Structure formats: C-alpha cells, structure tokens
C-alpha cells in the first residue's frame, strides 16, 4: 500500500445523487485513520439487527478495503449502503437527498451497527449522557474573531458545565452554524492538537480530518501523516463525464499549503483576506463543519 | 408551560408546552414562530440531542428550562458548469436559486463578472430573473458557460 495510490483524479469515493454527506464522512473516518476500525471487525451477536452483517461486510470489503488498496470506490457500493439506510429509516431521503452527516452517523452507528457511544459527558454532577459527537454552542460577542477549536470546545463545555466521564479515543466536534446563511465565525482555526486534560473530572488528542461544507456540498480534508504538509483534499464530485446519462469523477488532491496556514496565529489569519488564502486552505478555515480527533498515533513525544 | 429555546443566532424563543409532549410537537410550534421546518431543527438539552419519538419529562425538562436549537444543513445540490475548452467548475446551489445568484456564485468562486457570463442549459440562454427549478435543472446537471 501507500499514499501515491490514494492521490489523483478518479480517486476517492465516487459521488452520485446528493451523496457528498456520505462520501466525505466515510473518507474522513476511514481513508487513513484506524480509530473506528473495530466497528468493521466486530462479530455478529444476539443483540445485532437484521442488516448488521451485510452492512458491515459491504462497508469493510466493498468500500474501505478498496479505498485503501486501490484509492477508488464506485458509487454503486455507496448506493447499496444508502439503500440499507433507507430500509432502516424510511421516507427520509437516504437515496435521493443531501442530508446531515449527523443523521447518517446516528443511523449507522446507533441502529445498524450496535456501536458503543464515543462520548460520555457529565453535566454538573448529573448522570452521564451518551453520544457520537459534540455540538459547539455558545454566545459570540465577547469572544475572538477567529477562535481555535480548543477555545470553542472549552467555551461550549463551560457554557453548559460539561465534562468527560472518560477520555474519548474519537472526538467529533460540530462547528457553530445555523443553516446555510449563518456562521458564527467567518474563520475558525482547527487545532492540530487538543488538550482535554481540564475537561475530565478526576491527556492529548490529534486532528486527523475536517469535514467541510460551504452551503450544500460536503468535501473533506485529511491529515495522513505527522508532517505539517501531510494534508489531502477530497471531493466526491470534482468533475463529470457525459451529461444526463453521465457520471461523476471524484478527486483527491494534496494541499500542503494548509500545514502552512496552521503554523500562523489566528490573529494573522484574521488580518488576511480570504481571497488571498491560497489553494484549498480557504475552504478549511471558512467552511469547517466537523473537526475529528483521535488518540495520538501519528506524532512523536 | 413556559420553556426557552435558544438559537446560535442569539434569539431566545419562549414556548408553551406540556411535560409529556413530543419533541415533534415542539418543532411544529417552533416552525410557527420562526418559519423553520422541523426536519431542519435539532433540539439539544445539556449537550444532548433530543429525539422526536421521546417526550420532555424523560429528558428532565420542567418549566423555565432552556434548550438549544441549531440547524441542519439540508437540501441543495451541486451542478457542473463547463466552458467550451472543457474546463469544469462545480457549484453548490438550490433549485430555488435564480440564475442571477448563480452567476454571483460563479464570480465568488472564479472571479468572472456576472454580466460577462452567458449561461446555457438544454440549448436555452438563461435569464437572470428565473430560477434553476424553472429550467428543470436538477442535481449534477451540467450548464455551459460562454464568455461575452
């Protein structure tokens, strides 16, 4: 295997019919990271739903494995997964409409794959609450023009007095947005590392992906290496071949420039016109929807 | 009774419920008061997303309590716009978008001034006042751009 097989035109997950929410999440979660690999390896039990086995086998052998070895997956495979999803949650547009990654993850991880909650959170000595991701929510006016994800997490946690019951191995954070026409911050600095030490009643995590969207189309950024420059951008529908009977062509491109913007301070990014942000880095800083964090495997010290 | 729904925008809607009411019924009340469709709505209480098949009493929700609301990013689609050379540009749009703001989007992504753009779909030049839906332009359909 290697990196060179994952990079280029006709690479990644092939989009088809408003599927970018699915293609980009999968890409974020499985293209390079291994934090949720157990989810694909866990044997069928009594408690598991009817579609479990074939869901897991489709996800493992027709999607993740071909992605990792060939760098490409057909939209037909994704379409089979969307069909299962629609079998579980009917009349919700799983085969037709662009939806929220949150809903995809909930159906897949709660209903079909009997998946242990990734987050256990305690609010002010209450009993813990289970979820797969965390939503940043607070008021802006006092705060800085371009915050880091660190700061957002802190402020959101304090705003509702939360703590981790135990340290997560996979932390998916949703950025503070309110529909298409509203972003709390024009730019947000995605911290490469998260110190959660002061958020556990009683220590580190690393950023491996960022799921972005401007208004309706999801795209992905992925950190494949500890190197500053080790970033990829993925787009399930970067090009099209044919017309109505035609089809989409996904692309995975390298965006080292990202590593350079994340060496700068937020105050430097703020004083910088988004039109002067080179390459795909603009989309990262401006269109971030989910930051995904994992227990450090890529780095040293 | 009286609860408070708090939005990221900063607005704090005040609502009249009964402790055994469904999260569904509420989203309908919120739609009446803010126009936001229920399928876009996400109720969150104490960092916990509230499911619609459940009731309020079970989330420990009593009067004067405050839930959070944020919106899902749903609908809309991508279309492809090709020049005569073959160069492709992708665009995030909605069916209700007019051709005018589509041209605006082309300028935000590529720099090209809107009144220098000629859009064609199915052989028809596209008029600024009309929407993509009016030209029956669906997901992943391709428009052509020529420069005057």
GROMACS .gro file of C-alpha atoms in nm, chain B:
model
  148
  302UNK     CA    1  -4.587   2.565   3.044
  303UNK     CA    2  -4.301   2.802   2.962
  304UNK     CA    3  -3.964   2.691   2.823
  305UNK     CA    4  -3.694   2.877   2.633
  306UNK     CA    5  -3.545   2.775   2.304
  307UNK     CA    6  -3.211   2.929   2.243
  308UNK     CA    7  -3.061   2.970   1.891
  309UNK     CA    8  -2.697   3.022   1.790
  310UNK     CA    9  -2.812   3.345   1.627
  311UNK     CA   10  -2.879   3.467   1.984
  312UNK     CA   11  -3.260   3.474   1.975
  313UNK     CA   12  -3.445   3.318   2.273
  314UNK     CA   13  -3.789   3.191   2.175
  315UNK     CA   14  -4.042   3.139   2.455
  316UNK     CA   15  -4.280   2.843   2.418
  317UNK     CA   16  -4.596   2.693   2.572
  318UNK     CA   17  -4.583   2.311   2.615
  319UNK     CA   18  -4.698   2.020   2.839
  320UNK     CA   19  -4.432   1.791   3.005
  321UNK     CA   20  -4.547   1.478   2.816
  322UNK     CA   21  -4.545   1.648   2.470
  323UNK     CA   22  -4.320   1.502   2.199
  324UNK     CA   23  -4.011   1.672   2.066
  325UNK     CA   24  -4.201   1.660   1.735
  326UNK     CA   25  -4.494   1.881   1.856
  327UNK     CA   26  -4.245   2.143   1.973
  328UNK     CA   27  -4.060   2.163   1.638
  329UNK     CA   28  -4.405   2.238   1.490
  330UNK     CA   29  -4.452   2.519   1.741
  331UNK     CA   30  -4.105   2.650   1.661
  332UNK     CA   31  -4.194   2.642   1.290
  333UNK     CA   32  -4.497   2.863   1.360
  334UNK     CA   33  -4.287   3.113   1.543
  335UNK     CA   34  -3.966   3.119   1.329
  336UNK     CA   35  -4.066   2.954   1.000
  337UNK     CA   36  -3.801   2.689   1.036
  338UNK     CA   37  -3.912   2.348   0.917
  339UNK     CA   38  -3.896   2.064   1.175
  340UNK     CA   39  -3.675   1.845   0.961
  341UNK     CA   40  -3.403   2.117   0.980
  342UNK     CA   41  -3.436   2.151   1.355
  343UNK     CA   42  -3.224   1.995   1.620
  344UNK     CA   43  -3.315   2.029   1.982
  345UNK     CA   44  -3.028   1.996   2.224
  346UNK     CA   45  -3.050   1.989   2.603
  347UNK     CA   46  -2.735   1.987   2.823
  348UNK     CA   47  -2.519   1.883   2.524
  349UNK     CA   48  -2.776   1.611   2.442
  350UNK     CA   49  -2.970   1.595   2.112
  351UNK     CA   50  -3.334   1.527   2.170
  352UNK     CA   51  -3.507   1.257   1.973
  353UNK     CA   52  -3.860   1.316   1.838
  354UNK     CA   53  -4.017   0.982   1.943
  355UNK     CA   54  -3.935   1.064   2.306
  356UNK     CA   55  -4.110   1.302   2.546
  357UNK     CA   56  -3.997   1.606   2.753
  358UNK     CA   57  -4.041   1.463   3.102
  359UNK     CA   58  -3.778   1.193   3.026
  360UNK     CA   59  -3.508   1.449   2.946
  361UNK     CA   60  -3.583   1.602   3.290
  362UNK     CA   61  -3.748   1.910   3.129
  363UNK     CA   62  -3.959   2.134   3.354
  364UNK     CA   63  -4.069   2.498   3.325
  365UNK     CA   64  -3.812   2.778   3.284
  366UNK     CA   65  -3.561   2.531   3.135
  367UNK     CA   66  -3.355   2.614   2.830
  368UNK     CA   67  -3.286   2.401   2.529
  369UNK     CA   68  -3.055   2.478   2.245
  370UNK     CA   69  -3.150   2.481   1.878
  371UNK     CA   70  -2.919   2.464   1.582
  372UNK     CA   71  -2.997   2.392   1.216
  373UNK     CA   72  -2.910   2.106   0.989
  374UNK     CA   73  -2.756   2.169   0.653
  375UNK     CA   74  -3.000   2.006   0.418
  376UNK     CA   75  -3.129   2.024   0.061
  377UNK     CA   76  -2.947   2.193  -0.218
  378UNK     CA   77  -2.717   2.020  -0.454
  379UNK     CA   78  -2.423   2.052  -0.688
  380UNK     CA   79  -2.428   2.144  -1.059
  381UNK     CA   80  -2.149   2.146  -1.310
  382UNK     CA   81  -2.066   2.434  -1.533
  383UNK     CA   82  -1.843   2.375  -1.835
  384UNK     CA   83  -1.669   2.615  -2.070
  385UNK     CA   84  -1.613   2.535  -2.435
  386UNK     CA   85  -1.250   2.443  -2.375
  387UNK     CA   86  -1.365   2.168  -2.135
  388UNK     CA   87  -1.262   2.341  -1.812
  389UNK     CA   88  -1.507   2.242  -1.543
  390UNK     CA   89  -1.637   2.438  -1.244
  391UNK     CA   90  -1.865   2.298  -0.970
  392UNK     CA   91  -2.130   2.497  -0.787
  393UNK     CA   92  -2.327   2.447  -0.470
  394UNK     CA   93  -2.683   2.559  -0.536
  395UNK     CA   94  -3.053   2.509  -0.462
  396UNK     CA   95  -3.343   2.465  -0.707
  397UNK     CA   96  -3.495   2.796  -0.587
  398UNK     CA   97  -3.171   2.985  -0.677
  399UNK     CA   98  -3.207   3.237  -0.954
  400UNK     CA   99  -2.974   3.244  -1.247
  401UNK     CA  100  -2.857   3.578  -1.117
  402UNK     CA  101  -2.718   3.446  -0.789
  403UNK     CA  102  -2.580   3.151  -0.976
  404UNK     CA  103  -2.371   3.396  -1.176
  405UNK     CA  104  -2.281   3.557  -0.846
  406UNK     CA  105  -2.163   3.223  -0.722
  407UNK     CA  106  -1.953   3.182  -1.040
  408UNK     CA  107  -1.791   3.513  -0.961
  409UNK     CA  108  -1.725   3.428  -0.596
  410UNK     CA  109  -1.551   3.103  -0.697
  411UNK     CA  110  -1.380   3.201  -1.025
  412UNK     CA  111  -1.372   3.587  -1.033
  413UNK     CA  112  -1.570   3.624  -1.357
  414UNK     CA  113  -1.807   3.925  -1.358
  415UNK     CA  114  -2.177   3.824  -1.372
  416UNK     CA  115  -2.268   4.040  -1.669
  417UNK     CA  116  -1.983   3.890  -1.870
  418UNK     CA  117  -2.136   3.540  -1.831
  419UNK     CA  118  -2.364   3.360  -2.073
  420UNK     CA  119  -2.528   3.053  -1.919
  421UNK     CA  120  -2.694   2.790  -2.137
  422UNK     CA  121  -2.890   2.482  -2.037
  423UNK     CA  122  -3.057   2.241  -2.286
  424UNK     CA  123  -2.976   2.496  -2.557
  425UNK     CA  124  -3.157   2.786  -2.387
  426UNK     CA  125  -2.985   3.104  -2.273
  427UNK     CA  126  -3.063   3.151  -1.911
  428UNK     CA  127  -3.242   3.461  -1.790
  429UNK     CA  128  -3.133   3.624  -1.462
  430UNK     CA  129  -3.478   3.660  -1.311
  431UNK     CA  130  -3.566   3.291  -1.340
  432UNK     CA  131  -3.468   3.001  -1.111
  433UNK     CA  132  -3.285   2.673  -1.179
  434UNK     CA  133  -3.607   2.491  -1.094
  435UNK     CA  134  -3.786   2.684  -1.371
  436UNK     CA  135  -3.546   2.539  -1.619
  437UNK     CA  136  -3.587   2.192  -1.460
  438UNK     CA  137  -3.218   2.190  -1.361
  439UNK     CA  138  -3.157   1.901  -1.118
  440UNK     CA  139  -2.870   1.753  -0.912
  441UNK     CA  140  -2.548   1.710  -1.103
  442UNK     CA  141  -2.684   1.856  -1.423
  443UNK     CA  142  -2.435   2.046  -1.645
  444UNK     CA  143  -2.475   2.409  -1.774
  445UNK     CA  144  -2.248   2.566  -2.027
  446UNK     CA  145  -2.073   2.896  -1.980
  447UNK     CA  146  -1.951   3.113  -2.268
  448UNK     CA  147  -1.784   3.449  -2.215
  449UNK     CA  148  -1.902   3.764  -2.395
   0.00000   0.00000   0.00000
